[PDB]
Structures are given as structure tokens and as C-alpha cells.
Amino acid sequence: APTQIIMAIDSIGPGFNPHLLSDQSPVNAAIASLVLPSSFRPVPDPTSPTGSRWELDTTLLESAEVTQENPFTVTYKIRPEAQWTDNAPIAADDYWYLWRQMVSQPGVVDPAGYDLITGVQSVEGGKQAVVTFSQPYPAWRELFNDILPAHIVKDIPGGFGAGLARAMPVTGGQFRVETIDPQRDEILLARNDRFWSVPAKPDLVLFRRGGAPAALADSIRNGDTQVAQVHGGAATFAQLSAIPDVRTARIVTPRVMQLTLRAQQPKLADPQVRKAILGLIDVDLLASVGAGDDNTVTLAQAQVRSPSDPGYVPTAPPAMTRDDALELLRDAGYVSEPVPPPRERIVKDGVPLTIVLGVASNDPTSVAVANTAADQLRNVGIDASVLALDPVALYGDALVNNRVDAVVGWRQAGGDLATVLASRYGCRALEAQAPSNITGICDRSIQPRIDAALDGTDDIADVIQAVEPRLWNMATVLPILQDTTIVAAGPSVQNVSLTGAVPVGIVGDAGDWTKT
């Protein structure tokens, strides 16, 4: 009988491509850490604006260095032994492929750094990757992590955008993916026998649905479950902590939920209407729905920084009342009229105000939030609705063809802040290269500061301080919450530190886990 360690999770999540906004999840981040190769891995560092320092992964690489400063260039020297699970080499082609996807695919994680890449050339039989940049990019160590098998993802049904939703057939790490089971909500990982370095101690690691708090409690109490990373509130936390010799903590997850308005929509072109819509929405209500009873809410009250960032301070302007929001609508030329027979309703020169909130049908939590947002607008006579779509259609079709007025979904937390700022609010990220600024607008007066932060000639903390008011004033982005989870380790498992960098979580040392 093989040694198996069981880790409890909420569910398997929306997908397994870490580079997609649609797939942001603690489960997705955990599996990627364990099965995919990375150029650099994060470690906790309170000295970093991000809370993490990125350190060379010597398992995959011999080196990664700035080779020239004129045309800013980084050369990666990949290990000869480093291979995908199908015996194909992990090579410069995989680097080239990730760059092309990050720059061409809609709905990808903060690609401002990738956008600066001028070329990726293959040298030394594919074992050396020379990456050229159009400018200095100090955050380059965050590029080319969670690398995907180019020859595989290219041909797989769904491709980059949807191919890894329920499948990971070819991997390149300590562990491999044996099965992904949506019915049972299980992910079975096996030790990769074709791994080229120090072998993982456990034969198998099973991720499974924890179920109700009482059920998970008894499973850990009985010793059937060794580790847990789940959503739950103070009561659940207290129940798990009361089990003899069980270690528990609440950690932040590398994602923040946001609601974004599409300001390029004519009905939302007026900033005062945008302010009114956001002012009619109770963000505290959205957060509580987003977190649930079974969760403790960490409010997201800044634009650039996530609550988990060491320098995080709320920057949100004072909350608007309901009467002032309605006052703003009246000034914009809106009135209310009776509803025609086959309540009350809001119209501008006879045209009812309509708001369609786009969301990934993949994500029950975001879907619930979008619905509560729509409920609130419907209460004041706005014809608001939710359009739940396939993740690829959402960012690729609905946004490009203006089928929605707003988007609810997750963004990465814990990444370089300059890259966050540029990707989401920058003028260059509007150009359409699928736009990463899905807002439809930018503030021109702050662009030099964004550029200077991105190339590192300006301190990011000073840039954030200077630009935050202007970001809020655009009235396009409403941050909701940062995701948190309860983590636990029972006495029956060894070498489980419930600590790690924000991007990774608690699975960084999973290769060392032993039981009894």
C-alpha cells in the first residue's frame, strides 16, 4: 500500500491555468506549485512591498541573470535533465510559448511585464532562453513561473484559455496529476517517477472536498485527514482548533475580488453616473456575500495594494449615501416613472437604465456577488441583470463586443505592484494585444508615474501614494475583498509548516510531508 496524505479543500475550483483571471484560486495555486516548473519561487520577505522575495529555482535552472543592460536582456540556463512528464525537454520553446500567450490572450493575470518582452530566442539546443526587453523591468523574476508544456497545451481541446480547466495531462515537477474528479471534488497527485531531482516523500497526495465543518472536524479528529485549507468563519476555526494537537491558522489567499465598470459604454461614459452606480452598491454587503457566513471578511479598501501587502493602508474615499447617489442620477438627467401595465423605474428621456453584470458561470461565489449587486440596483428601479458566461467568452467575446456593462471576478494578489498598476489602469494596456485594462479608460496625467514605477526609476510606494486618488476618481473599479482560508495540520502528519509566501500558500514543503 502506497503512502497517501489527504488534504481537505472546499472544491477543486474553476481551473488549473494559473495565468488566467478565471482560474485564480488557492487550489489552482497549490497544484501549480507542486506539478509545474518555475524559474523562481517566492519566500516570505516583509522588506518587499509585495511581502515576497523571488528566489531562483535550482531544480529547473542553473542560472537566470541580466546579461545586458543596453537592450535589457535576461538569459535563463535550463537544466539538461529537466523534462516534461512525457519525456519532452523543458526548453526555451516553453518560455517563448508562455510569452506569446500572456501577450495575446484575453483575461490573463497582470501581463504588463510580459508586454515589455521584445523576443525570446532559443540557444544551446533549447536549453538556453535569451529574453529581450524594450526597457528595464526590475520585476523580471516574476516572469516565466508556472511554465506550461508548449507542445501539449497548443493541441489540447480548449487550448490556453480552457484546456486546463479539468485536465493536466503533462506536467514537469516533483508531483504529477493522476486524476481530476469534478463529481467527487478530488485531485489525486502522484510522485513523478520521471522527476530529475530529490523525490517527494509521499507516494500520493489526495485533495478532497472537506464537506460541512462538523464532518471535516471529525475527519481530522479521526486522523483520516492530515491537512486542510478551507473557507470558514470564527466558529469553524474554533471547532478545528479545539481538536487535541491540531495546529490551525487563518491565512490570506493570493486573490482579490473586484467589480469593474465598462466606462467605454455610452451609458457609463459620464463619471457622475458611474459614481452613482457604485454609490448605490453596498460594498460591505458584497463582501459578506463574497465571504459567506462560513468565512471571515477581509475588506479590500485600496486600488493597487491588497490587504496582504506589507504597506497596505485603506485609500477608499468616504462612502456615499443613497440619496446622494440618486441625486447624482437626477443631475445626469434621469427621472423615475411608473411601470406600464402588461413599483417605479428609472429612465432617461424615456429609455430605462439597464445594467448587465458579466461573470464567469464557472465561479459560484462571484456569481452570487454579481446577483446581490443586481438586487441592489433593482431595488431602486434600475433594470439590472447578471450574464453568467464561459470564462473564455467573458473576456474574449463579451468584453470585445460590449455585451456587458460590468465584470465581477478575481485578480491576483501578491504580485509586483507596478505591474498591477500598469496592467489594470495604464493607458498602454487599453490599446486594442488583448487589453488588460478592461476599464475602457485611463488617466493621462498619471501615466508618466506608472511608466517610472514600471521601469524602476521611481519608488512604487511614492507612485501609489500619488496616484490612488486619481484611480478612485475614475469610478471604474470597486475592490471587494481579499480571500482568506483556514489552514490546519493534524498530529498524524510530519513536516507540515502552516507557513509560506502569499502566492503559494501551505504546499511549498509538500515533498517533505510524512505521516504517522
The CATH number given to whatever domain includes residue 86 is 3.90.76.10
Burial of 507 (0-12, 13-18, 19+ CB in 10 A): buried
User: From CA 389, how far away is CA 394, in angstroms rounded?
Assistant: 6
Residue by residue, DSSP assigns 47-104 as TSTTSEEEEE-TTTEEEEEEEETTTTEEEEEE-TT-B-TTS-B--HHHHHHHHHHHHH
Residues 167 and 113 in one domain: no
| φ, ψ of residue 337 in degrees (nearest 5) | -140, 155
Residues 74 and 159 in one domain: no
Residues 29 and 58 in one domain: no
Helix (H) / strand (E) containing 355 = strand 354-360
Helix then strand then coil, % of the chain, to nearest 5 = 30, 25, 45
Q: Which of 90, 125, 149 is the last residue of a domain?
A: 149
Name beta bridge partners: 181.
186
Residues 317 and 396 in one domain: yes
Residues 145 and 192 in one domain: no
Cell of 108: 490573463
CATH number for the domain harbouring residue 162:
3.40.190.10
* Residue 91 · residue 142 · CB < 8 Å: no
Our count of domains for the chain comes to 3
Residues 512 and 473 in one domain: no
Residue with cell 528595464: 136
Residues 510 and 419 in one domain: no
Residues 454 and 514 in one domain: no
Strand pairing class (354-360; 345-348)? unpaired
Q: Which of 88, 116, 149 is the last residue of a domain?
A: 149
Q: Each residue of 287-321: b (16+ CB within 10 Å) or e?
A: bbbbbeeebbbbbbbbbbbbbbbebbeebeeeebe
User: From CA 74, how far away is CA 487, in angstroms rounded?
Assistant: 37
User: From CA 243, how far away is CA 257, in angstroms rounded?
Assistant: 32
Quick check: helix, strand or coil at residue 105?
A: coil
CATH number for the domain harbouring residue 402:
3.10.105.10
Name beta bridge partners: 406.
261, 357
* Residue 486 · residue 252 · CB < 8 Å: no
Residue with cell 446622494: 324
Taking only Cα atoms into account, the Rg of the chain, rounded to an integer number of angstroms, comes to 23
Q: Which of 122, 149, 176 is the last residue of a domain?
A: 149
User: From CA 128, how far away is CA 114, in angstroms rounded?
Assistant: 18
Residues 209 and 275 in one domain: no
Q: HEC string of 136-180?
A: CCCCHHHCCCCCCCHHHHCCCCCHHHHCCCCCCCCCCCCEEEEEE
- Taking CA atoms, 135 is separated from 37, 39, 448, 474, 514, in Å, by 26, 21, 14, 28, 46
User: From CA 259, how far away is CA 278, in angstroms rounded?
Assistant: 9
User: What single letter denotes the amino acid at residue 80?
Assistant: P
* Residue 414 · residue 502 · CB < 8 Å: yes
The Cβ-side half-sphere exposure at 116, using a 13 Å CA radius, reads: 23
Residues 495 and 396 in one domain: no
User: From CA 450, how far away is CA 460, in angstroms rounded?
Assistant: 9
- Please measure the distance between the N-terminal and C-terminal CA atoms of the chain and give it in whole angstroms: 15
Length of the chain: 516
Strand pairing class (128-133; 117-123)? antiparallel
* Residue 104 · residue 22 · CB < 8 Å: no
* Residue 226 · residue 5 · CB < 8 Å: yes
* Residue 80 Cα to chain centre, angstroms: 32
Q: How wide is the angle at C-alpha 20 spanned by C-alphas 168 and 357, nearest 5°?
A: 130
Residues 297 and 358 in one domain: yes
Residues 279 and 381 in one domain: yes
Q: What is the resolution of this structure in A?
A: 2.4
Nearest CA-CA partner of 204 in 34, 43, 445, 61 = 34
Sheet of strand 128-133: strand arrangement: 61-68, 73-78, 128-133, 117-123
| φ, ψ of residue 428 in degrees (nearest 5) | -70, -25
Instruction: Domain of residue 287: give its range.
Output: 255-483
User: From CA 360, how far away is CA 230, in angstroms rounded?
Assistant: 21
Residues with Cβ within 8 Å of 76's Cβ and at least 6 positions away in sequence, in order, are 39, 61, 63, 64, 92, 95, 128, 129, 130, 131, 144
